[PDB]
Specification:
It is classed as immune system. Keywords: Immunoglobrin fold, immune system. It forms a dimeric assembly. The structure holds two protein chains of two kinds. Chain A is mainly beta. Chain A folds into two domains: 114 residues, Immunoglobulins (Immunoglobulin-like, Sandwich); 93 residues, Immunoglobulins (Immunoglobulin-like, Sandwich), CATH 2.60.40. Chain A contains no helices and 19 strands. By secondary structure, chain B is mostly beta strands. Chain B folds into two domains: 107 residues, Immunoglobulins (Immunoglobulin-like), CATH 2.60.40.10; 103 residues, Immunoglobulin-like (Sandwich), CATH 2.60.40.10. Chain B has a five-stranded mixed beta sheet, with no helix packed on it. In chain B, strands 1-3-7-6 form a four-stranded antiparallel beta sheet, with no helix packed on it. In chain B, a hairpin with a 7-residue loop joins β16 and β17. The N and C termini of chain B lie far apart (61 Å). The chains are: A mainly beta, B mainly beta. At the A-B interface, β5, β10, β12, β13 and β17 of A face β8, β10, β11, β14 and β15 of B.
Chain lengths: 207, 211
């Protein structure tokens, strides 16, 4: 139904832009199409929407910096938030709804910072009846980063922890538990992706 | 500038137990919507017009209220109902949201599985040395990790992180990472990760020897 897209890192004082490509319904037929964001801390804020007709409605406190427009032909609408500040760092979601029904996108994170993109360094964590394996992803910026095990075949038994900020760099860790008789017999590898720097690393966990 | 106060911020409920969450408005509001958001996904409207249900929302859920007091009730909870619930109003501009109420699911106490990991080769080859410790699948969430190098609590310089309540077994997991410099690391020998939870009188210890 709805997918959000746009650059991840945007400098303070500049403008933030996002695209929502809708599929399975004409955004000119019906529904109200909104832009809603969630700040780190989970606080939510409705930003605005545009009717089936280019008529718009914005959150008063954003009225001077926001603009919502669309391109019928491509079945997508956009969001521009001018003069961003770090306070605009958030997960942006696009959505639609009528009195009875709503649809949302997966949401896309945008970081407003003067800091510069830094790839992460992936380190393996092997043991000092199941065995617990790890993977340390540290020194990167901005968020997000994705971590999978064996390309996803090892999804269950995985605990990927929230990243923690420190010295203007995020650090994260991930764990996976498997039967003692599976590792190191069968290869266990953590896959890490960091789109902001187009990084894709693979670290085999060696005993 | 219409403040929505939700209470409590966090609350736990056993399966089958009735559950009620409150939303207090700073000024009267005519309507109120509720949204549900589970870990890793996006909000989803749960209730509109203060009391109506959108297709897909279990009948066990119901909303009610008026003026400055609204509430979301779960007649009987199921573990699938664990999430954060936000109330919102469209009466004034802008359409404010409450800070949300996190509904935890209660369950028997479960001891944490502890695992400790020495710095890797790749890392030690960059002068770095991060010691990591995992405390997986425990309950209650409140727990405390303690680092010790050569028998002395290496207190500061530790980064901890918690996962949300597991959707499968309803437990919690946490990670503790003490970062040192390659040189300070090779200057000590005993590295212990000590965890004190509700599941044991004595702390659960785990520790390697740098050799």
């Amino acid at each position: 139904q709805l997918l959000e897209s746009g650059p991840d890192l945007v400098k303070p004082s500049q403008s933030l832009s996002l695209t929502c490509t809708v599929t399975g319904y004409s955004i000119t037929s019906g529904y109200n199409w909104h832009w809603i964001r969630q700040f780190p801390g989970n606080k939510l804020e409705w930003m605005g929407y545009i009717h089936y007709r280019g008529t718009t409605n914005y959150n008063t406190s954003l009225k001077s910096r926001i603009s919502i427009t669309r391109d019928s032909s491509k079945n997508q609408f956009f969001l521009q938030l001018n003069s961003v500040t770090t306070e605009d760092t958030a997960t942006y979601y696009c959505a639609c709804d009528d009195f009875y029904s709503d649809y949302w996108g997966q949401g896309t994170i945008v970081t407003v910072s003067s800091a510069k993109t830094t790839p992460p360094s992936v380190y393996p964590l092997a043991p000092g009846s199941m065995v617990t394996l790890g993977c340390l992803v540290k020194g990167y910026f901005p968020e997000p980063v994705t971590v999978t095990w064996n390309s996803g075949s090892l999804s269950s038994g995985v605990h990927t922890f929230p990243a923690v900020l420190q010295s203007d760099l995020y650090t994260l860790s991930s764990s996976v538990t498997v039967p003692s008789s599976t590792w190191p017999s069968e290869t266990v590898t953590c896959n890490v992706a960091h789109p902001a720097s187009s990084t894709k690393v693979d670290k085999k966990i060696v005993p | 500038e219409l403040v929505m106060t939700q209470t409590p911020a966090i609350m736990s409920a056993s399966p089958g137990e009735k559950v009620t969450m409150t939303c207090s408005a700073s000024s009267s509001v005519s309507s109120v919507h509720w949204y549900q958001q589970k870990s890793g996904t996006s909000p989803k409207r749960w209730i509109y017009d203060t009391s109506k249900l959108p297709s897909g929302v279990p009948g066990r859920f119901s909303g009610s209220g008026s003026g400055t007091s609204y509430s979301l009730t779960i007649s009987s909870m199921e573990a699938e109902d664990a999430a954060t619930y936000y109330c919102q109003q469209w009466s004034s501009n802008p359409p404010t949201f409450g800070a949300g109420t996190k509904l935890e699911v209660k369950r028997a106490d479960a001891a944490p599985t502890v695992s400790i990991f020495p710095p890797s080769s790749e890392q030690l080859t960059s002068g770095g040395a991060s010691v990591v410790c995992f405390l997986n699948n425990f309950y209650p969430k409140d727990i405390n990790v303690k680092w010790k190098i050569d028998g002395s609590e290496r207190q500061n310089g530790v980064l901890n992180s918690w996962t949300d309540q597991d959707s499968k077994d309803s437990t919690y997991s946490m990670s503790s990472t003490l970062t040192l410099t390659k040189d300070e690391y090779e200057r000590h020998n005993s590295y212990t990760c000590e965890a004190t939870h509700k599941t044991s009188t004595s702390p659960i210890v785990k520790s390697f020897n740098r050799n």
